[PDB]
Design a protein around this nucleic acid. Structure first.
Lengths: 116, 65, 155, 65, 95
RNA sequence: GCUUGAGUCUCGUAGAGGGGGGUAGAAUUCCAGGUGUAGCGGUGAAAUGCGUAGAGAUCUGGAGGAAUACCGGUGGCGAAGGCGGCCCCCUGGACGAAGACUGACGCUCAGGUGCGAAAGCGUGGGGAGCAAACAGGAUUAGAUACCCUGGUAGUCCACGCCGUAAACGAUGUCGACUUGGAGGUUGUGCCCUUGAGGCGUGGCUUCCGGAGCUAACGCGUUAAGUCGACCGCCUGGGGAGUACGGCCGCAAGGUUAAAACUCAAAUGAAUUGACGGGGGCCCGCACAAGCGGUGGAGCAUGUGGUUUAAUUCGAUGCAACGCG
């Protein structure tokens, strides 16, 4: 329960799927929703509209916590990543920060081969 | 543009971090000399001052610190 | 076509009522170019609409048409090595013409005895929204709203 | 990268900072070390960059219109 | 697949007819499903020439081959048609 | 003897030149814990795979390996191969300014000697990610491949071996000479450093072009121009850089290097076409948007085939088949 007020809304933004989860300031999660679980499967999982439906399905089931302000973390080069945040300020939230936290290696491990 | 380091005879050291924060971008990355207009000799020793200031925590590697 | 935004020509209106919208409607079910045989069926089908609905005749026709006209239409779009059904919003001059074509193709099946009463039964049932003409409109919207994932426009 | 702007919400002011160097980098770490094709592509790049310098300077003679 | 064998100055035998259909059974399954075939055999004082018109789900394709003794002409005709059938097949896959 | 070639020294300057040791941050993976719940992952679509034994996402902490984002530059250095975080230690060469010094000490080399990407090999470690082989899932007529999910040698370290690459600038080394332009990089001189100014002068380097050269493409002061010194190499295509022999190597193999036979060509550059599942632009009931047909029915008619004593002959993809 705990009725927390300010939270963090992480957005995983892979190419094939967009995952949006909502946590608090401390970092432990509250609820999540994906674009593959919103009824979109296959070619339509990589659509910015499917990231919007994943957002409003995650904007519900956190009414139990009562969030009115949250930060936004985006991670990945996805087709969503900005249509998700438009489905949150329209859902009645105060977006204090929007932050890019995508992982960039300062040249570390070897990626796979280019597919032909 | 021009190089103010070539306007004087000074040396770009890592301890003068007041003049280095206008040479990095808003996320800690080094700004290229094709934007700033620094000479290529002073740009090479500027990055050696950025990299030493990053080791001694006078400048951040990323913005997630 | 490639060239030639075509110079559009006009239609002469209906004699009995001052409308070209119903004159467009009589030209659709006019099979093999027989207009007197076409106009006799539609006049016998809308006087039957008045007694079976209570209203006046011509405005009972479009209230069966706003219940059957669509707002979006889905298309096949060729992109990449495949082709999916992207939805597009309909222009209004096609919107009514796509509606009254759906009425006639439902009127040639749904086989009752005469053609005048075959049209007269579902022009009522378009207003009560249980006929098979409205089930064409709702299953078009069922496919377009399922394909809301394809579009660079948000309206 | 980090926008904590006030007033009316419109990332609009976010994609200015973010579409700067946050997607070209992740799409090129996406796959393949290359180890020698960077070289090829790099060297093809500037042979076409001076193709834009040495032609558009020679294109200011006339335009036939 | 329906064969239609026809000869201009080459009256087709029974051994030649089964030699066509056994060869046209090859370029069958192994390359594409087809609707209807017209085969034309011709002799023009030197050239044993054999034509063929295939009808597929997309369009039509035709090939011709002149040969040595009317058996090598059809053997060169199938290799001309089989390459046009793989080009047409991958034109309709585009994965 | 001489100082102009070559070399020594005195001051500096730039540099991913090399070898050794330390260390930092980002990220991947794994492990542990918290929260949390039905999906994740993947693809053109899909499945294998993972997940209700709690994944994925998210947060904290830890372990370990490899690689050094931005700077990063037709930029720099090195004989070539090659060399990128940062710091120290040892160390090689190049270059410039002003002199001083020895006095042809030079150039090039068959053999020889050393160095020499990647893969591979031996012994001993290490092993995150990637990934031959291999395994499964797809695609397909088939798919032993491309794609997908996994995944072992290998990639890493030390010490040896191998001695090969489209090891390329497809251009041996050295020296001299012969119109220019735009730069990059790195020293330095003078004048008003009086201002990121102006004039010069070196080194390396990139591009474009003159004469001339070249079969043409192109090269063009860093020549493929004009010359000199020496070395390597070539002699029609296949056979064949193969066989045999020698040498070298643990092995893989390297190196040296034929002949029989066979062909009248092989080849280079450019030209005009044609073609491209190359690019741009445009048109046509070509598609789309619609209406009415065919293919299914009986019949009329033409053809193929079969039949017959003859079923006259010609027309055969589109452009023959209600055609002569």
């Amino acid at each position: 329960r705990k009725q927390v007020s300010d939270g963090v809304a992480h957005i995983h933004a892979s190419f094939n799927n967009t995952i949006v989860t909502i946590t608090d300031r401390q970092g432990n999660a509250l609820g999540w929703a994906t674009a593959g679980g919103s009824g979109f499967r296959g070619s339509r999982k990589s659509t910015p509209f499917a990231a919007q439906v994943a957002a409003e399905r995650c904007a519900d089931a956190v009414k139990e916590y009562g969030i009115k302000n949250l930060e936004v973390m985006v991670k990945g080069p996805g087709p969503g990543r900005e249509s998700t945040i438009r489905a949150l300020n329209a859902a009645g939230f105060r977006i204090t920060n929007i932050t890019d936290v995508t992982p960039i290696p300062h040249n570390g491990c070897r990626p796979p081969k280019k597919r032909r | 543009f021009c190089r103010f380091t070539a306007e004087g005879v000074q040396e770009i050291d890592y301890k003068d971090i007041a003049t280095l924060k206008n040479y990095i971008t808003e996320s800690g990355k080094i700004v290229p000399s094709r934007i700033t207009g620094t000479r290529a000799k002073y740009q090479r020793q500027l990055a050696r001052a950025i990299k030493r200031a990053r080791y001694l925590s006078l400048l951040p590697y990323t913005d997630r610190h | 076509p490639r060239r030639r935004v075509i110079g559009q020509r006009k239609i002469l209106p209906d004699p009995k009522f001052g409308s070209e919208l119903l004159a467009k409607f009589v030209n659709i079910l006019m099979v093999d170019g027989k207009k007197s045989t076409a106009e006799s069926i539609v006049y016998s089908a809308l006087e039957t609409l008045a007694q079976r609905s209570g209203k006046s005749e011509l405005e009972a026709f479009e209230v069966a048409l706003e219940n059957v006209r669509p707002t979006v239409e889905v298309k096949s779009r060729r992109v990449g090595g495949s082709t999916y059904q992207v939805p597009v919003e309909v222009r209004p001059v096609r919107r009514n013409a796509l509606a009254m074509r759906w009425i006639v193709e439902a009127a040639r099946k749904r086989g009752d005895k005469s053609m005048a009463l075959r049209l007269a039964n579902e022009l009522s049932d378009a207003a009560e929204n249980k006929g098979t003409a409205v089930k064409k409109r709702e299953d078009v919207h069922r496919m377009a709203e399922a394909n809301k994932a394809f579009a660079h426009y948000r309206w | 990268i980090k926008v904590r702007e006030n007033e009316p919400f419109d990332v609009a002011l976010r994609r200015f900072k973010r579409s700067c160097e946050k997607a070209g980098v992740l799409a090129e770490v996406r796959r393949r070390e290359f180890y020698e094709k960077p070289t090829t592509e790099r060297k093809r790049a500037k042979a076409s960059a001076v193709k834009r310098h040495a032609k558009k300077l020679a294109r200011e003679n006339a335009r036939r219109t | 697949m329906q064969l239609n064998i026809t000869g201009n100055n080459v009256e087709i035998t029974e051994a030649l007819r089964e030699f066509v259909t056994a060869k046209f059974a090859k370029l069958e399954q192994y390359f594409d499903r087809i609707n209807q075939v017209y085969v034309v055999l011709k002799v023009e004082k030197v050239t044993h020439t054999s034509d063929a018109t295939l009808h597929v789900d997309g369009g039509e394709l035709h090939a011709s081959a002149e040969g040595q003794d009317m058996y090598a002409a059809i053997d060169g005709l199938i290799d001309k048609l089989a390459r046009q059938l793989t080009k047409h097949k991958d034109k309709l896959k585009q994965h």
